[PDB]
Design a protein around this ligand. Structure first.
Ligand SMILES: *Cc1c(COP(=O)(O)O)cnc(C)c1O
Ligand SMILES: *Cc1c(COP(=O)(O)O)cnc(C)c1O
Lengths: 317, 321
């Protein structure tokens, strides 16, 4: 009878595409960007988070008020999981290294997640072990496992990809996306292929941490991208190749997107756009429609390198 | 849809959602309009677009030529910087040197020029400074948010009609905080032109209840209670102005995140408190009450909203593995 949503989770998905007009000077191709900032949590994460918790409910694995959900994660998957746990009324326990961002930790707590900070000296391996110890010692507990839970890939197959196919009226020639868990690129990749097999799909990863192109893992600044190993759910075969983008270029492009397109986006959005533009400058792609994603809102990263210059220029005055 | 041509086409058309956890069992329907879904994540994108577009159309300004000046910070500064970056205008925002570093960095990221003024002159100093700039700069134009009727008009033309459409004409009551008064005036006039029985309430801080005859004063409801009656604000359209304390608005905002999954600001809290207060009244049982959550809460990580959480987080220690 009305267009009023019954649930906050119904605000998830169905996000807009926008053409880039300024930054695309000298490109034979059209680039459009999917804006995931328009979600309850202001990041792409909201999709997998809903999908994993909901899938586990339908399979009768978890019960609200009785199951303790456990996950070794932080950074915008942690925020989305905390968010979902709040809406559906699950106890959510998140393990992370103590050197984790204070801004992320405060945000996850605002939704009621319990945080356990593990010893810094043991890094990620520490939080994963901690989370497994808690899973084994907690009576009604369940771990989501974002890197191997196929409901992660499935959500993009059923919502992210179909949205991209519909909004471009079947015209998308090329899809570019950074790899984190690999869920987005794998799920959108498979869906687009099943509609038109000539659609080219590309991954993006940091130059400084290029493990999928045979490099060694290492620190980088493309937040959300490049975990340093191959996730189980990542589908290597659906991609033409994994493009590499340096942190420097991704950072610079993110700044430009704000100044010239009015898109306040993160470093990951930066890297995707760099990859898209350079595909868009290739002669064979002339006239083609290339789609990429801006996975989250830029204001989340106010204390990162993205606003480094602005932050200190503003301190001095 | 098809692909949009400009980011500005993503302004407006925000969804309504029912609250069901903070509202048990207040006896009325409460739906909240989610303004976080805007390019700058606040309802300040509507007015900023309308005021700049209005001036272009009356040929008072031109991109590349005109310098836009405005004494503002907060959500309206961010939105103003955002609309200038997009349309191609040089933008000058004056503000007290005490304004939040994060807001300033955000305004800078869109390319606005910032001029900070004496911490002792408060708002007056920034306004005085802005008027000097206006008179000392060739081809300068000041937007004037508190006295520009294009502010009210955008809510009459978008925000109001959206609420009437999404509720399929069933809205009985609309509650909204007053900053400039644009939203409450514009939505009010619209809704009442569709159904005169619609009740429109404004909201202000207890600590600065000027519209109720009190004296101005420091409060924590960011975006709300500017300490005087803005010119564009239409008092006649409201039944009255409800007062909400800062403590209550803050508590409501924290509870909205924990129970409803809505990460919103202190102004969203204040509006939701007022909405619940109306639900308590006998004449409002069974009615559809609509209010607004004007912004995303992550913007206020440095405010009193997050204070308890920041301290608790500072004090967490690692555990052994
Ligand atoms: C998750 C994430 C990605 C990568 O998405 P995946 O589906 O996990 O591979 C890219 N950018 C940001 C900001 C992300 O949060
Ligand atoms: C700007 C604003 C308001 C009030 O809107 P007006 O139309 O100016 O009265 C309320 N809350 C927040 C967060 C705002 O930015």
């Amino acid at each position: 009878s009305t267009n009023i949503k019954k649930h906050v989770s119904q605000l998830i998905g169905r996000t807009p595409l926008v053409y880039l007009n300024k930054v695309t000077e000298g490109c034979g191709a059209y680039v459009a960007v999917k804006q995931e900032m328009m979600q309850p949590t202001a990041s792409i994460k909201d999709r997998p988070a809903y999908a994993m918790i909901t899938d586990a409910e339908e399979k009768n694995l978890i019960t609200p008020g009785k199951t303790t959900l456990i996950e070794p994660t932080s950074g915008n998957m942690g925020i989305s999981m905390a968010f979902m746990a709040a809406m559906k009324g699950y106890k959510m326990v998140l393990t992370m290294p103590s050197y984790t961002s204070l801004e992320r930790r405060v945000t996850m707590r605002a939704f009621g997640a319990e945080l356990i900070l593990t010893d810094p000296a043991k890094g990620m391996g520490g939080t994963v072990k901690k989370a497994y110890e808690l899973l084994e010692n907690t009576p009604n507990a369940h771990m989501l496992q974002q890197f191997s839970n196929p409901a992660n890939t499935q959500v993009h197959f059923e919502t992210t990809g179909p949205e991209i196919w519909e909004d471009t009226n079947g015209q998308v020639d090329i899809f570019v996306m950074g790899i984190g868990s690999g869920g987005t690129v794998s799920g959108v990749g498979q869906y687009l292929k099943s509609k038109n097999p000539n659609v080219k799909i590309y991954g993006v990863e940091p130059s400084e941490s290029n493990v999928l192109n045979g490099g060694k893992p290492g620190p980088h600044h493309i937040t959300g991208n490049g975990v340093g190993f191959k996730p189980d759910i990542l589908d290597l075969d659906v991609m033409e190749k994994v493009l590499e983008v340096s942190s420097e270029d991704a950072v610079n492009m993110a700044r430009v997107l704000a100044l010239k397109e009015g898109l306040m986006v993160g470093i990951s959005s930066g890297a995707n756009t760099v990859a898209a533009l350079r595909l868009a400058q290739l002669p064979e792609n002339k006239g083609k429609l290339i789609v990429t994603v801006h996975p989250s809102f830029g204001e989340r990263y106010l204390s990162s390198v993205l606003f480094q210059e602005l932050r200190q220029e503003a301190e001095n005055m």
